[PDB]
Every structure is written in structure tokens, then in C-alpha cells.
Design a protein around this ligand. Sequence first.
Ligand SMILES: O=C(CN1C(=O)COc2ccc(Br)cc21)NC1(C(=O)O)CCC(F)(F)CC1
Ligand SMILES: O=C(CN1C(=O)COc2ccc(Br)cc21)NC1(C(=O)O)CCC(F)(F)CC1
Ligand SMILES: [Zn+2]
Length: 857
Amino acid sequence: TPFPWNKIRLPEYVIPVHYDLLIHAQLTTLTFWGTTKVEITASQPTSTIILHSHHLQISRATLRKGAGERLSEEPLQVLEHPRQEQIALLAPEPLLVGLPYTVVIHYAGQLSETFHGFYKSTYRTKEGELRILASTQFEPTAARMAFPCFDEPAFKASFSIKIRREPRHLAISNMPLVKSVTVAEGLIEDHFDVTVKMSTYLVAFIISDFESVSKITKSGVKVSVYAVPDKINQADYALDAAVTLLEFYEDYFSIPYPLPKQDLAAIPDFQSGAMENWGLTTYRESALLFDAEKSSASSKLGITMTVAHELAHQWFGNLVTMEWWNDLWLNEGFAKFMEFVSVSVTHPELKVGDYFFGKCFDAMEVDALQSSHPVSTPVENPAQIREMFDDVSYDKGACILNMLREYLSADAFKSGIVQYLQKHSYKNTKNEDLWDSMASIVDVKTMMNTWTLQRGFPLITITVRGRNVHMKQEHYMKGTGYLWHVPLTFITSKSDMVHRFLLKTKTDVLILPEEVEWIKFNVGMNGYYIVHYEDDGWDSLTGLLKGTHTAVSSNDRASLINNAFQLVSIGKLSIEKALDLSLYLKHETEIMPVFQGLNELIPMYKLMEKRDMNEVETQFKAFLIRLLRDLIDKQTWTDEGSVSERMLRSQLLLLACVHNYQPCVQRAEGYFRKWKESNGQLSLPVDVTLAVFAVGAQSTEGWDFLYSKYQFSLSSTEKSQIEFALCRTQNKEKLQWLLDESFKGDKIKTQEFPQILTLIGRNPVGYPLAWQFLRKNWNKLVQKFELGSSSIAHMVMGTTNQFSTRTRLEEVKGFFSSLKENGSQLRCVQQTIETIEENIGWMDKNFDKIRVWLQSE
Ligand SMILES: O=C(CN1C(=O)COc2ccc(Br)cc21)NC1(C(=O)O)CCC(F)(F)CC1
Ligand SMILES: O=C(CN1C(=O)COc2ccc(Br)cc21)NC1(C(=O)O)CCC(F)(F)CC1
Ligand SMILES: [Zn+2]
């Protein structure tokens, strides 16, 4: 019997209203069974119900009509289309239009051994015992692996969840537990309250032995953090941050959080950083748990931002959801942007607003390639949908919202988002709904369509002739018509007021009131565009940075460093002039411009490390250390100062030690010797630990001692610092061991494998082993992480994007084209090919220039 539906999307005429999900998971055999009851209505006569199901064995399906006295049941015939992840249920007579029916499906499955669906997670107690738990991760299309459903985000429905479990386990889900009932064969059935109307991807449930801590918000919401018993003592920071952030968002949006409780659970095995399931947000332990003695300043910032992101989603994603995955940025760009809006207010000590522009420069790297896609773009299958979870949806999405907020003003933008959330509460939206809301408070639709429907971003060229300022825009591309409505901003030598000019055409002109010594566009890097200055423009800004660098903000200095190097890539500025500009960094003190200098200069030597260029590579590395030597020398070996001072310290000390700067290497060797002689008991300053461990792991004894401490650590920062240090070994047998062991998941968890593969891919001696490992183990890696996932995209780019020869380009093209349906069409593959093509052209043009410049410098 042919399958009666030929489309990836489900029919639009059968709609669910409510699901009753009963799940029994047997953690001793990894089998689960369920009964799903879904109340539906049909708007056109049909005898066939199509819905999603993947890897579930259906034992029986029946169609009910009526209740009690008038109940009628009809058996349904079940058909399956595994490639479309669908099942068809066939009734013996047509459904009556507009009348309620209940589909009842009994099925079984096996707990997934991936990080998606209803999956197995494990950990070892500090006493050595292996513990098994089961958790869910459904976004985007994995709810269908746990229960048959209409698994598209616009089919919203309420869910009543019941979990049968052993008495030794605890079950939690989206809503509060209302009753526990003893049932047959020594089990307990927990009943959770009904959810509000929501998408299938947000259903969650966890069966575990977690401990918890709680705190109540001013609005009466019970917030709890859940974690393994040996780590609940690290939950207080996130619990306090979650309460403060939930209160912030309730007040900011003028829309209360609608559920009685909000849980934050730290899962021992988790693929992404975290997930926003309504009422039960989930996290990697590293993204939630803070150890006041061992956690880094960057991890404290990361936890605060991750909790802020997941809580923003309770409104931007859960309450209002995109209609389809083509508009995922409506959830992700907004959640990413709201991390900055909220934490800027709640945790002013972190100064996060200072770091926002760095995410925009991240998105520009990828968005400058021909393989970039517009923010809103069509997707159909699960691998294509997973690809939407990328720097374009998150970082470009947040950056264009920041640009729009600065353009409209914060209060008008806030009014627009409140109207949007109120109007579309418990419903789904598309781009046009957001523009209509923003305009209900001036032009938003035409402008924002240029930023969401075209890939890339413009280069703005400025030409100054006395008072006359000529502006032009063109599409910036590495390696056609494009036009944007660009909300330009500028300051000058005579005015530090941020002046505004909306450029909606290819060119325009403005007249300054009086002549100026310099002009600087894109103030604070709040716009998603780059700027080139004709004539003496770059010499003037180079002179400004060299003589009076504090004449512009720290973020404006970072923007000039980034844009000068981006202009070398397209031939608008010579590499010598960009390197001459970078010389001002000898007197720079602020984290953002220092880090931006590293971001531009470090990749040049990473390319050289994989080429026959030792002489220039050594000279370039020596030039970098000479440039930052005074700042390196001023660093104290302590945890003193602000979060920015701590992050700057840690990065500089690590960089100096990696480059064999003897004053730092000798200090690190002394701390490692003392720490090792104390049997790893010694509390080292967290901010010097990366440098100390990286130096210590360069001997066989130090590497072995460091790895021996890894199994006992309960600190996510300490385990990350150890992983980084072990991956810097130049012993190829130890590097292959790290890959084999993290891939296996026993001594080092598989959730760390993408990071270890990238670190080994960046190791100056081990880099061929990472690309080799990826090729050899491709099928198993895709099975574990999924085609289209950000984890697979990070492994592809991490192992290949620093290649710069035609032989390496053909390895990449040849390997991925050979995969056919199992990866040849991945967007990350096209991105790494275009990146390697750019690296080939850039090194051919600039290598000799850099060699000559270094000999003169
Ligand atoms: O180079 C890298 C990793 N990395 C890239 O691969 C590509 O571009 C980058 C830009 C900025 C920064 Br910070 C790091 C990178 N890390 C180090 C290295 O030389 O491999 C150098 C820095 C260290 F010293 F802090 C760690 C090691
Ligand atoms: O390398 C990374 C980031 N990173 C990965 O990319 C892959 O997985 C990891 C595992 C452990 C640690 Br610690 C870092 C990473 N960061 C730095 C760098 O880019 O070289 C710059 C910041 C730094 F100084 F804190 C560590 C090194
Ligand atoms: Zn998100």
C-alpha cells in the first residue's frame, strides 16, 4: 500500500489541541514505552491522519470519539514512511469535520545513545559508582523520537505528562508535579500539571537522582537548580542569577512568566550549551555550575549570559514562536540580543555591553563569503533546519536588532517588542509580524527586509573634501546589485556627539558644519557594516591611534583594527598599512582592542604553521610578543581586578607561555612544580592556571600528572583547562589517545570531543591527525552529533579552515563530495572550501609582503 502523503511538511487540515503523554522508561534495559493520546480536529473530511514518528515501534493505534457513555473506538491501520519520518493512521470511516477525536497510540522505543530525543546520560559518583539517567533534547525535530506527534512548531497544543519510574528515581518535567501514584510491578506514576499551549520541541522530562536548591521570585515563581548530588554545591550562583533575570524580564516585557515554577537542570551529557524547554531549561554542567574557587572569570560571564539567553527564550521562542524554521532568528537573534540588554542591567559589574560587538565581528567572518545565507532563508529537511542554528541566526540576528534598537531608540524598540509579544502570545510569527509591531509605535519593513533577505553586509566608503562628506555603499565580499538601508553614525575631531545619517541609496553626501581633522563612522561598532576611508583617511586614523588613542572609545579602536584587516582581504588597504596601524597596540591597555589585535594577527601565523614557512612564522610570532611585551610584563600572577582585567591577564599569560617568553615560562614552571609537589592540592590563581597547566603538560611527567587529576575534578573550568593543556602536547601518540578516548566517551566524555578535535586541529604538530580522524570516523560522528548540527559544522571548520594550499583544498573537496547524501551538501563544507580558497589567495598575495615588512620592522 503506497504511503498516502508525499510532502515533508504535514497536512494543514488535521490539528492537535492537547496531548496526554504517558512514558515508562526502564533505565536498567534502556527501553521505554509510551501511550500518546492526542485530541485533534479535522477541517476537511479525511480518513487518514499523518503525523511524525522516528525510531518508535508502534504496537496499536485507535481513534476515539466521545466520552464515557457515548465513546466509540475504531482501530487504525498504521503505515510508515521512515525517510519522511512520518506515519499514516487510516480510519474505517471519515472523520466528521470540526468534531473532536482522540488518536491513541501505544509504542515502544530504545533510549537514544545520541544527545537528542529521549537519551541516556551517565556520570560516576566521587565514590566510583556509574549512575544512569534519561533526559530529553527535542529542538528542532526530535520530539518525534520520544512520542508520535505533529512535530512542527506552528501545531501548538497543551501537554499533560505522566512518567512511570522506579521509586529510586526522581522525575521532573515542564510543569509542577501534582500527584504520584503507586502502580503495578513496583513503579510510581508521576502526574505533571497541564502545560500552557506550546510547541512539541519544548516538551521535556528527566528521570535522575538529581539534588536541587530553590528560591522564590518577587512574583511567586519557584526557581530551582537541579544537578548531580556531588555538584549541587555549585548551584547558588546560577540560582541567584536566574531569579534576578526572570524578575528583570517580567518587568521589562510587562508580561508575567506564566508557569508556577522554572527549573534549570545541569545535565552530565549535553550537546549544545543549553536549551529553553518551558519550565525546565537544561544546560551543560559547564554552562550552569560555578565553583567560587576554581571557576574562571570567563565561565562566570558565560553562566550569566547562558541563563539570560534561556530565560529570554521563555518570551522569545516559547510564548511567541517562529511559524517555521526559515525564521528561527526571530527566536535566536532576540534571545542572544536580550542576554546583553538584561545582563547590562542585572550584573553591571560584568560590563557585557562592552563585549557585544565581538559577536558581530564573528558573524562578519562567515557572512563575507559567497556561501552565506540571508538571516531568513528556506529550509525543509531536518539537516537543513539544524543548519539554521548558526552564527547568522544568533550573532547576525542580534547585531541587526542592536542596530535597529539604536536607530529607533531603546524606548521605541521596547514598546515595539512589548506589542509584538502581547499580540502574538501563544501563537506563531514571521518576519513581517515583527516589522508591523515595530512600526505600530517610522520605516522598519523596507529597512529590515534589506538586512534579513540579502546575505552579507555593506562596505561604506567615506571620502572627505573639506566640509563635504561623500558616502557610498557596496556589498563587501571576499573572493551584484545589493543595497541596504544603513543607519550610519559618526563622530569627528570637533564633535563627540554621535551624529546620525540614514544611507538608503548607493551614494549620498552630507556637509559638516566646519572642517575636521578626522571623522570616524560606525560609533561603538553598533552597525553591521564596515568602513573604508579614501585618500589620507587611513593615515589620519592611524595617526590618531598612535598619538592620542584615547580620542576614541576602546570599542572604536577595536573597530578600526578589525576593519583595516578586513580591507586588506579585498585589496582596499595594503597589508603593510594594516600592520603599521597595529603597531599602536604597544600602548593599548583595554581588553577589546587587544583581543581584536589577536583576532586579526594570530590567524596569520596559524596559516604559516601548516606551511613550509618556519623563518617568517618565527619572526611573526616574535613581532606579536614584542608588540604586547609591556602589557604582558605588567600582569600580576593573581585573580585581582574586574572580570575584564582577569580575562586579559589569563589570555596574555597563556599567549606569552605558548610563545616561550622566558619570564612567563619560568614563573609558570615554578607554580606547576609547586602544585605537582603538593599532589595537586595547592590552590593556584585561576587566572594563571591555563598558562601553568599548558607549560606543565610539555613534559611526559607533567602531562601524566595533569591527566591523573582530571578524573577526580568536579570543576568544569579545571577540566577545560586540563583538556586545553593536554591538547598542546607535541607527542602524537598522546594526541591520538585524546581523540580516541573522547570519541569513545569513557575517560573523557564525548560532549568534549568537538572541542578536543578543534584544539588538536590547531596544534602545530598534531593538526594532520585531526583532519585524518574526522575523515576516518565521519559516519559514527554524524550518527552521534547529526548532519547539519553546529557540532559537525565546528568539527569541519576546526580541522580544515586554516589550510592554504591547493592540495589541501582538493582533499577537502574530494572527501566531502564523496559522501553524497551523507554530507556533500552541508553548508559548513561550502564555507570551509570558500575559506581555504580565500587563505590561498591571501597568502599568495601577502606572504612576501609580510616577510619584507618584518625585515624592515
Ligand atoms: O591560535 C590559537 C587559536 N586561534 C586560532 O586558531 C585562530 O585565531 C585565533 C585568534 C585569536 C585567538 Br586568542 C586564538 C585563535 N591559540 C593559540 C595558538 O597559538 O594555537 C594562541 C593563543 C593562545 F596562546 F592563548 C592559545 C594558543
Ligand atoms: O581555544 C579557545 C577556545 N576553545 C576552543 O576553541 C575549543 O575547546 C576549548 C577547550 C578548552 C579551552 Br580552555 C578552550 C577551548 N580559546 C583560546 C584560543 O582561542 O586559543 C582563547 C581564550 C583562552 F585563552 F582562554 C583559551 C584559548
Ligand atoms: Zn537560543
